[PDB]
Design an enzyme around this catalytic site. Sequence first.
Site, PDB file in Angstrom:
ATOM      1  N   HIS A  56       0.835  -1.200   0.000  1.00 40.65           N
ATOM      2  CA  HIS A  56       0.000   0.000   0.000  1.00 40.65           C
ATOM      3  C   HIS A  56       0.870   1.252   0.000  1.00 40.65           C
ATOM      4  CE1 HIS A  56      -0.295  -0.108   4.577  1.00 40.65           C
ATOM      5  NE2 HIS A  56      -0.550   1.177   4.456  1.00 40.65           N
ATOM      6  N   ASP A  94       4.938   3.579   5.650  1.00 37.56           N
ATOM      7  CA  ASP A  94       5.472   2.419   6.345  1.00 37.56           C
ATOM      8  C   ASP A  94       5.747   1.252   5.385  1.00 37.56           C
ATOM      9  OD1 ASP A  94       2.633   2.068   6.238  1.00 37.56           O
ATOM     10  OD2 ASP A  94       2.767   0.601   7.884  1.00 37.56           O
ATOM     11  N   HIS A 142       1.206   3.894   1.914  1.00 31.96           N
ATOM     12  CA  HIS A 142       1.657   4.635   3.083  1.00 31.96           C
ATOM     13  C   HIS A 142       3.166   4.449   3.257  1.00 31.96           C
ATOM     14  CE1 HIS A 142      -2.773   4.719   4.711  1.00 31.96           C
ATOM     15  NE2 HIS A 142      -2.515   5.879   4.109  1.00 31.96           N
ATOM     16  N   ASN A 170      -5.284   4.481  13.289  1.00 33.73           N
ATOM     17  CA  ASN A 170      -5.630   5.546  12.367  1.00 33.73           C
ATOM     18  C   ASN A 170      -6.376   4.899  11.200  1.00 33.73           C
ATOM     19  OD1 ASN A 170      -5.221   7.829  10.277  1.00 33.73           O
ATOM     20  ND2 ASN A 170      -3.876   6.188   9.559  1.00 33.73           N
ATOM     21  N   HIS A 179      -8.052  -1.190   4.981  1.00 36.72           N
ATOM     22  CA  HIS A 179      -7.229  -0.155   5.616  1.00 36.72           C
ATOM     23  C   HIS A 179      -6.914   0.996   4.637  1.00 36.72           C
ATOM     24  CE1 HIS A 179      -3.916   1.617   7.992  1.00 36.72           C
ATOM     25  NE2 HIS A 179      -3.252   1.580   6.834  1.00 36.72           N
TER      26      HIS A 179
END
Length: 232
Positions: free
Chosen positions: A84, A88, A86, A180, A149
């Site tokens: 994904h 991280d 993000h 979050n 998510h």
Amino acid sequence: GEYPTVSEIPVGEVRLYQIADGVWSHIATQSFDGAVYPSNGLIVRDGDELLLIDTAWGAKNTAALLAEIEKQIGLPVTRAVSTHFHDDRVGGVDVLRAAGVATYASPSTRRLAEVEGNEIPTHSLEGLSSSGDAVRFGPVELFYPGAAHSTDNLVVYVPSASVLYGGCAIYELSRTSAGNVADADLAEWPTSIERIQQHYPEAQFVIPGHGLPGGLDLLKHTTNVVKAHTNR
Ligand SMILES: O=C(O)[C@H](CCCn1c(-c2ccccc2)n[nH]c1=S)N(Cc1c[nH]cn1)Cc1c[nH]cn1
Ligand SMILES: [Zn+2]
Ligand SMILES: [Zn+2]
Ligand SMILES: [Zn+2]
């Protein structure tokens, strides 16, 4: 052995954990917002090379992951997939790219990464744009369950070891609250997990984006947590 926790992992360091023959998780830690949280990625042996799933979260963590791979496995990482957009999961893409890793993500991931101003994996994975889409990627299958998510989240299955890597769409049992969820589709999340359930009912090991592996009951647990949050 015993799965590594934030305890056994100095921040800036990376531990590898052998789940099966030629399958490993990589575990790193990150200090956000006062607290310290672990993060999982996957490593899958591909002949005499290595496929990497997700960055270790940050340029410095990612450089430590490669060093730790070079030390413990000694096979070259030739490809990496981000599940994904993000930071991280794509943070460290530039480090990977500099070391000669071919970096991949879906067009949907690359688009959001760009919009986010994050690092952008070089190569595009075609054929994952529709909920329920799967494509083979060497020793794994890549699966788009639908929005969860995030709208772009992918899951990874290792047919040879029955390992399902859920990424951030799947929570560890310990996690009692939704994190979050700013980028999430709460309304579609449970349906997406059901797709995962229906597509991989034979999974033996389920690795969450963060924390301890388990079995397929991580899927029901995440459902339960997502639904309680929806109802807050
Ligand atoms: O899920 C969460 O919200 C976070 C983990 C954030 C990791 N992350 C991020 C991220 C978070 C900070 C910087 C860059 C990327 N994007 N997607 C995911 S997943 N923690 C802490 C938190 C904040 N609010 C509620 N929880 C949850 C967590 C997981 N494991 C231990 N704690
Ligand atoms: Zn995320
Ligand atoms: Zn290339
Ligand atoms: Zn995450």
